UniProtKB/Swiss-Prot annotation:
It comes from Mus musculus. Disulfide bonds join 31-77. Tyrosine-protein kinase that acts as a cell-surface receptor for fibroblast growth factors and plays an essential role in the regulation of embryonic development, cell proliferation, differentiation and migration. Required for normal mesoderm patterning and correct axial organization during embryonic development, normal skeletogenesis and normal development of the gonadotropin-releasing hormone (GnRH) neuronal system. Phosphorylates PLCG1, FRS2, GAB1 and SHB. Ligand binding leads to the activation of several signaling cascades. This is Fibroblast growth factor receptor 1. The chain holds residues 25 to 119 of 822 of the full protein. Glycans are attached at residues 53, 93. The second and third Ig-like domains directly interact with fibroblast growth factors (FGF) and heparan sulfate proteoglycans. Isoforms lacking the first Ig-like domain have higher affinity for fibroblast growth factors (FGF) and heparan sulfate proteoglycans than isoforms with all three Ig-like domains. Widely expressed. The gene is Fgfr1.
Length: 95
């Protein structure tokens, strides 16, 4: 009842997806999901984040189809439930 790697095999201690995107393109960070976590927070840079304009942040994956200064930092994804937390580290950097 849990999908720990429902994206790619990139579960590493404080990393996940280190990718560079050019100025005006699509960049994405896909987390995991299970009958445990219900809220997926994408900590942009180094703190919780979930915007909209340019970035369509879904409780499972965050897709930014523009990669502006906005994707200059670490997008660590924290999937959580009232009593559990799992994290993946997507380094997303704008070129």
């Amino acid at each position: 009842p849990t999908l720990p790697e429902q994206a790619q095999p990139w579960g590493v201690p404080v990393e996940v997806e280190s990718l560079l995107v050019h100025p005006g393109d699509l960049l994405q960070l896909r987390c995991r999901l299970r009958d445990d976590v219900q809220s997926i927070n994408w900590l942009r840079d180094g703190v919780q984040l979930v915007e909209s304009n340019r970035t369509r942040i879904t409780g499972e994956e965050v897709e930014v189809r523009d990669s502006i200064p906005a994707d200059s930092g670490l997008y660590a994804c924290v999937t959580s439930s009232p009593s559990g937390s799992d994290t993946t580290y997507f380094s997303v950097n704008v070129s």
